[PDB]
Ligand binder design. Structure first.
Ligand SMILES: Nc1ncnc2c1ncn2[C@@H]1O[C@H](COP(=O)(O)OP(=O)(O)O)[C@@H](O)[C@H]1O
Ligand SMILES: Nc1ncnc2c1ncn2[C@@H]1O[C@H](COP(=O)(O)OP(=O)(O)O)[C@@H](O)[C@H]1O
Ligand SMILES: [Mg+2]
Ligand SMILES: [Mg+2]
Lengths: 349, 349
């Protein structure tokens, strides 16, 4: 019969997912060793399962391990360190996160003969170099998940011809605007997508041909490795210790709490770093202006709409506007641009 | 056995070619340093190889270099500058372009003992002065081409008695109309071909003798050096910067896009120069009227059919009509007049 569709993202910041039925999940990419949650169940009921993902994951040898994963793992003091996390796409940390995003997006009582076409992503520079790693790992993927405290398990095993690879930010403007940008694309124009990710910033462009079809410009588009939201969290971590003059250091929860607001509540008091937050965000925005113009010479004039996406684009939209003011806009769902783009352009097959 | 036939043109605007089997190619005369195309292969398939000519060219020392050549090189921002391109016929830029036109016109699985008679051209004033340059260079020509992304290679090496030189615009009306103009040539008449090329405009005539055979009039025919389509692109480039009043300047892609339409899409807006386009095309047409009458005194009355050809003749046919209205016509394939003329009049041998 027909095979199901689930679009997932493998972003180091936060795993983003959506299914065929437009139910979507989002949670930070943090795991920890799960332990038995029974006492805290009595105090506060788990209304939202996304907040409290305790999970059990089997394998082919049925060697289960518990995992605090996602939002609950951020509350744990022994979690994955997440600021020097492994960059390997075949890591067990990526294995658990991939299982969890599949766990929340398979609805109840699907037919077991009906499989799932899953659509994933790689960074745009790494889509050729690191292709066969995730291509073989998803072939190697054979587990069975178990949700503690909610008592529903899912079987997770994929053959070939179910998995599907598209680059990061590719289908976000290849599809998802293809019905809408027909009035906006004209001829010999350029559209631009700037995904401000956590570790790596994506810059991807497309040329509109004479036949009013998009086509890709690999010499006008690249992935900025080492430039992204992580440079803010790495800088403001140093800015806190220098403001402390004690050697005290925020943990992984306090640090990710910091650069959403800039005002951590530290030792009965707010330690204010609001000046260094606005300063470092312009510092990141400057290193996306000047790197866009490295790929874009006088070609910058020929654009018609620079879209931006990613989680970081939402918090930088005013500062990042000055690449091309009053032309550039914001995509509709800044996190789920890669998700919906993998969904619709994954529905081609 | 029988030796194959390929007719090529060496026009600075766009290389025009045709084979013995009437398969013909056309691409602009732009090269650039080729790089590895693998990521863009995944996005959009190369259906037409003429659009996406990535190529590898060996030599006698097997020193290969990659080349983005033709339409793809126009999309590159580091290409051959093409507005001050070298006029040398023995340049490496001419070497690569000559190899590429031979690459697309040798069909699959020809016998290696069967060679190819290639027919080229020189400008009509330069056919005597610059004869031995291309005559020796094609003797010096020894390479082996490799098409990336399509995986077919061709061996390219020519001895003497395969190469063949005819002037530009010569065989276009010497042959290619010789079967058809029998009803139109009478006696002591003049036929005229005006090739509006990119850099140089060709004016070539023929006298019909008493024996109803064509014969050449070198004092009634010359090549207009410095007059041609390039004077439009050089003028409208100045017209854009003067309309901008910013110092901004179009690149090689935007400039060649301009004077096919006159309306470049510049910084979210159309910068209109439609008035200066119609004005400069009459300015070029005036400098072909007055230069034709420099060679043609009261001899102008004795014509019977002024043909025009070249790429520029197609876009100037209405303005250039006023040399001799309602006598003058347009050749059938305005680009391939030199190509088919080199083909049939190259089939004499
Ligand atoms: N409301 C917010 N306030 C501050 N930062 C945010 C907010 N939402 C998202 N972010 C930042 O955006 C990042 C998420 O980026 P994301 O689009 O998931 O890219 P990736 O695919 O690389 O993980 C987070 O690391 C976070 O720092
Ligand atoms: N559709 C078109 N619109 C505008 N200009 C054109 C068009 N087709 C051809 N041309 C012009 O004609 C030139 C091609 O001339 P061509 O016949 O190749 O002469 P040459 O042998 O000197 O290269 C191009 O440089 C271009 O400017
Ligand atoms: Mg991303
Ligand atoms: Mg010509």
């Amino acid at each position: 019969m027909n095979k199901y569709t689930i679009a997932i993202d493998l972003g180091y910041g936060q795993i983003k997912g959506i299914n065929q039925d437009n139910k979507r999940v989002i949670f930070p990419s943090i795991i920890s060793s799960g332990k038995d949650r029974s006492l805290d169940t009595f105090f506060n009921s788990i209304d939202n399962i996304v907040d409290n993902i305790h999970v059990k994951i089997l394998d082919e040898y049925f060697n289960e391990k518990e995992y605090f994963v996602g939002e609950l793992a951020k509350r744990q003091p022994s979690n994955s360190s997440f600021i020097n996390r492994d960059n390997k796409i075949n890591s067990e940390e990526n294995k658990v996160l991939l299982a969890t995003a599949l766990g929340l997006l398979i609805p109840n009582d699907l037919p077991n003969d009906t499989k799932i076409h899953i659509v994933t992503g790689l960074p745009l520079e790494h889509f050729i170099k690191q292709k066969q790693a995730l291509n073989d790992m998803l072939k190697d993927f054979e587990h069975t998940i178990k949700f503690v405290d909610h008592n529903f398990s899912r079987n997770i095993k994929f053959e070939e011809s179910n998995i599907t690879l598209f680059p990061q930010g590719a289908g976000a403007i290849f599809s998802k605007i293809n019905n809408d940008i027909s009035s906006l694309l004209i001829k010999e124009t350029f559209i631009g997508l700037i995904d401000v990710g956590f570790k790596t910033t994506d810059i991807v462009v497309f040329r509109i041909n004479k036949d009013k079809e998009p086509v890709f410009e690999q010499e006008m588009s690249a992935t900025l490795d080492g430039l992204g939201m992580i440079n803010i969290y790495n800088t403001m971590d140093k800015a806190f210790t220098d403001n402390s003059r004690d050697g005290s250091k925020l943990n992984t929860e306090q640090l990710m709490l910091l650069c959403e607001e800039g005002k951590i509540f530290f030792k009965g008091d707010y330690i204010d770093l609001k000046k260094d937050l606005i300063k470092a965000r312009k510092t990141l925005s400057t290193n996306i202006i000047n790197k866009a113009d490295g790929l874009w010479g006088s070609r910058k004039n020929s654009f018609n709409s620079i879209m931006i996406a990613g989680g970081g684009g939402k918090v930088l939209y005013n500062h990042l506007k000055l690449i091309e003011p009053n032309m550039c806009q914001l995509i509709d769902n800044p996190e789920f641009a890669n998700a919906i783009g993998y969904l619709e352009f994954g529905k081609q097959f």
